[PDB]
From Swiss-Prot, chain C:
Gene: RPL37A
Subunit field text: Component of the large ribosomal subunit. Mature ribosomes consist of a small (40S) and a large (60S) subunit. The 40S subunit contains about 32 different proteins and 1 molecule of RNA (18S). The 60S subunit contains about 42 different proteins and 3 molecules of RNA (28S, 5.8S and 5S).
Name of the protein in its database record: Large ribosomal subunit protein eL43
Upper classification of the organism: Eukaryota, Sar, Alveolata, Apicomplexa, Aconoidasida
Provenance organism: Plasmodium falciparum (isolate 3D7)
UniProt-listed InterPro entries: Ribosomal_eL37/eL43, Ribosomal_eL43, Ribosomal_protein_eL43, Ribosomal_zn-bd
Free-text function comment from the UniProt entry: Component of the ribosome, a large ribonucleoprotein complex responsible for the synthesis of proteins in the cell. The small ribosomal subunit (SSU) binds messenger RNAs (mRNAs) and translates the encoded message by selecting cognate aminoacyl-transfer RNA (tRNA) molecules. The large subunit (LSU) contains the ribosomal catalytic site termed the peptidyl transferase center (PTC), which catalyzes the formation of peptide bonds, thereby polymerizing the amino acids delivered by tRNAs into a polypeptide chain.
Disulfide partners: none
RNA sequence: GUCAACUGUGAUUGAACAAGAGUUAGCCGCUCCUAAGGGAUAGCUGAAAAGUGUUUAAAGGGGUCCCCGUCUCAAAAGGGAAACAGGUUGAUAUUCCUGUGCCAAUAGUAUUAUGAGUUAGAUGGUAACAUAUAUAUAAAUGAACUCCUUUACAUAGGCUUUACACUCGGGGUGCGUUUUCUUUGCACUUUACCUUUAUAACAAACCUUGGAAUCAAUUUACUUGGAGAAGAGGUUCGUUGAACUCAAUUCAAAAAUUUGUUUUGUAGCAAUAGUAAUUCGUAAUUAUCCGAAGUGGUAAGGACUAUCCUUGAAAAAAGGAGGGAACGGCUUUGUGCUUUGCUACUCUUAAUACUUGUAUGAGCGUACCAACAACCGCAUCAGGUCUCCAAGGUUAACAGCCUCUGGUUAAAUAGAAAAAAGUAGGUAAGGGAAGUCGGCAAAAUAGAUCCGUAACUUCGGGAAAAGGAUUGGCUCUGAGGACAUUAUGUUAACUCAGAACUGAAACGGACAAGGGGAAUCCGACUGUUUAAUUAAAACAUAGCAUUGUGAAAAGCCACAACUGGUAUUAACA
């Protein structure tokens, strides 16, 4: 839990990084967003 | 000590006197807890059911 | 002591458990917890410390013995038989 | 930390090159009293001087190169 | 706890090497700490030999 | 007063995790885990603790000064002086007996 | 920032949404070790898949050709090398910061300093045993090969020691009540690791002397003694952790090293840091910080005692002992070895320089929640979900009840009305189970002290049997300690027992808290069981009894095969 190892740490930061919405600068030339309580990672 | 008689080679060894702790089974067993402790260090042979 | 009329030390088990068995237990338990005489050192400090094992407190020596008292007759008879020849 | 009861030992420690600084502080008048704490890299040695004037004279006479530290 | 019989720690001396070696023997009634125990063809008849 | 909080990680009261609360210079009640109780050095043949020799955990026993670890006389911290005496007497008698038997036998 | 959706009512709120920021370790864990265990090697079986695990081994380590000797993973609560205090940020901190320290290291050669030893290896003490205080308690000859020990252990019961906690009383600071009464109520009066911590103290252990029965010493407890007690004089371990002359100084005496008087010190760390303050500037200063003692709530230790047909892990890692291999420096023939000649030298820690890849500190974790919405239950679900910290009054009490510190005043809604009906509750004249399958429900009873207690019984119980009495408040009386003057004082905790008076006769005044008796039937008993319609007369159990079996060609059972298990066994099995 509090305790973790490097692969879990990296993946959680990856999932956090991924979650952020689509950028609007691309859009002017869809989304899958996760909400933590409703959808668990299932790792 | 079963009463059995047997003929064995002369060179076979043995240890003089009787085994220690004689009379062990002749104290009355008081209770189920005593039986639990005896079997606790033996094996899953008790209770039989 | 004078607390019990005749039950004595098996008064710890009390009214629970059949009486004849309590009498049988009384004889074994009395033998078990007695302080026996040590052959080596001449004091009455020999007690049972584990099932077949009797240690004297004073001289700190472990004699292997019977279950409920130090000696059976069997070993004595054998011992005398070996000695005589 | 270790307290020192001998001026000669105090000077002998002081003269070692592991000494870096000496720290002085004077305490409440009941009559005043002076704690001189000497700083070697290994340890902080303390000597309690009853007389400030004696302590200050000893401190000035000891190794005038080394740093002096004052708590007020 | 598994055995019904006391064990006896007997010290023997190595014969092909230097120093003391300990064995674990089954106790006999009347055996005692500091007893000398003998084993072999040329052993005398005595309890625990 | 205030309650304490653990500081030492692994926050349980096991046999190796026994604790003394202490109030600080900050006036705060805090906790220290004491070093474990250690068995004493003994006479091997008597199985009993011996004089002079300090009782220390093996870490402290490794740092400990050499005078503390043992006794100067004969078989040092391994066995006690009364044990040593008995062995010396026995050793002396057995040699005396051995020579007398050799003289005696023919 | 923020309000589209969500936030079962509202909503500007938000654990929602958008943007950013945030987790820093030689010392805290993992990381290392083995356990219960898992996977393989050696083999051998099996078509293979797989099944096994020393079981027909020419395989891993240490020494100077010998000696050991299957491997590996498996504990974030077992074992285990080392850090604390104060401060600090919007959010981290044993980790940042400041101070103090501690730990594992730390290669080669050359310098230097530190003590030893020499003309090759110290001493003291009758003894138990002790001794290197160098900045730094550093080294007190020692090889092979050995032998030990720490690591390292159940449960229960009391006694005892300390700490933290709690309390009472005094002085000092500030704040509060203050008509009346209060020489008052409250807050604050702080002190860590570390320094073989130094000493003192004490339960034990051990030793010299001593020589005990008219037994003594002696604990709550019983223990101990001619295998040497009491006594007398020591010594050690362990607790502890600045106690106590402890250290310094003074003057007097031994003396030109000990004791008495004076002066210092929160032992150093340490006040400068903390805390209650106090002024001034608009960051700075000043003033403060300690005397007596009791309660026994927690925890740890100690010496023990008692019990088990139960005697309650291991290794890594470390230390101690035995043993007696080896042995000066400079020079050289002869043959690394030997004879000649010489003698400030040989050891040993620490610091320094020079060389040798770059000669100090690996890597991962560290946010927040831990459910009162973050975890699981399809969900901000009254369910479930592991551990520790534990204040005052009342009391047997950590129960129940109220209170201080800390926390909160939100629970998927609010308001207004107040009948039925529902539901959780109360209360009822006279009767008292006559209602109903059923006294179901509800109530009665219940705490202490003092009395009193039967049938019956395996004599242990029955038993709190039954059956009674008492209990508040107030003012007293009596009993139980510690110190020091030779009979007199100084002085502390609280618990017991008795007597009055007193009152709407009321007092275990709330509060917790048993209904009882006469019998039958069944099961002896403590135990166990139908998770979510089943706790019993069922199962287990002690006791009684039977059978088979003497061992690798045995019993009984498991495996496809080889092979296992019972078996770390052995007919008291």
């Amino acid at each position: 839990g509090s305790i973790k190892r490097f692969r879990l740490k990296q993946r959680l930061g990856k999932c956090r990084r991924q979650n952020r919405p689509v950028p609007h600068w691309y859009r002017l030339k869809n989304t899958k967003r996760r909400h933590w309580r409703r959808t668990k990672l299932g790792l | 000590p079963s009463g059995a008689k047997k003929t064995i080679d002369a060179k076979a060894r043995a240890m003089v006197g009787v085994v220690g702790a004689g009379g062990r089974i002749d104290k009355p067993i008081l209770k189920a807890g005593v039986a639990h402790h005896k079997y606790r260090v033996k094996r899953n042979c008790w209770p039989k059911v | 002591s004078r607390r019990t009329k005749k039950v004595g030390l098996t008064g710890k088990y009390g009214t629970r458990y059949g009486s004849s068995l309590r009498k049988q237990i009384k004889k074994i338990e009395l033998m078990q917890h007695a302080k026996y005489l040590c052959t080596f050192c001449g004091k009455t400090a020999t007690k049972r410390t584990c099932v077949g094992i009797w240690k004297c407190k004073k001289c700190k020596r472990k004699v292997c013995g019977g279950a409920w008292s130090l000696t059976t007759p069997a070993a004595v008879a054998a011992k005398s038989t070996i000695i005589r020849l | 930390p270790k307290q020192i009861t001998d001026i000669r030992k105090f000077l002998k420690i002081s003269r070692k090159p592991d000494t870096t600084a000496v720290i002085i502080m004077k305490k409440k008048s009941k009559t005043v009293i002076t704690k001189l704490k000497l700083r070697t890299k290994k340890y902080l040695y303390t000597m309690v001087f009853a007389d400030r004037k004696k302590a200050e004279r000893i401190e000035n006479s000891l190794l005038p190169s080394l740093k002096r530290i004052y708590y007020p | 706890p598994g055995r019904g019989a006391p064990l006896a720690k007997v010290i023997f001396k190595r014969t092909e090497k230097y120093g003391k070696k300990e064995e674990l023997i089954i106790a006999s009634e009347g055996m005692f700490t500091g007893q000398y125990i003998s084993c072999g063809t040329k052993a005398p008849l005595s309890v625990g030999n | 007063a205030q309650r304490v909080h653990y500081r030492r990680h692994n926050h349980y009261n096991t046999k190796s995790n026994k604790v003394r609360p202490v109030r600080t210079p900050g006036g705060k009640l805090t906790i220290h885990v004491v070093k474990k109780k250690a068995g004493k050095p003994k006479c091997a043949d008597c199985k009993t603790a011996i004089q002079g020799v300090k009782a220390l955990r093996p870490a402290d026993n490794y740092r400990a000064r050499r005078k503390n670890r043992t006794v100067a006389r004969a078989y040092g911290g391994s066995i006690c002086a009364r044990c040593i005496r008995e062995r010396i007497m026995r050793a002396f008698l057995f040699e005396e007996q051995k020579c007398v038997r050799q003289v005696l036998k023919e």
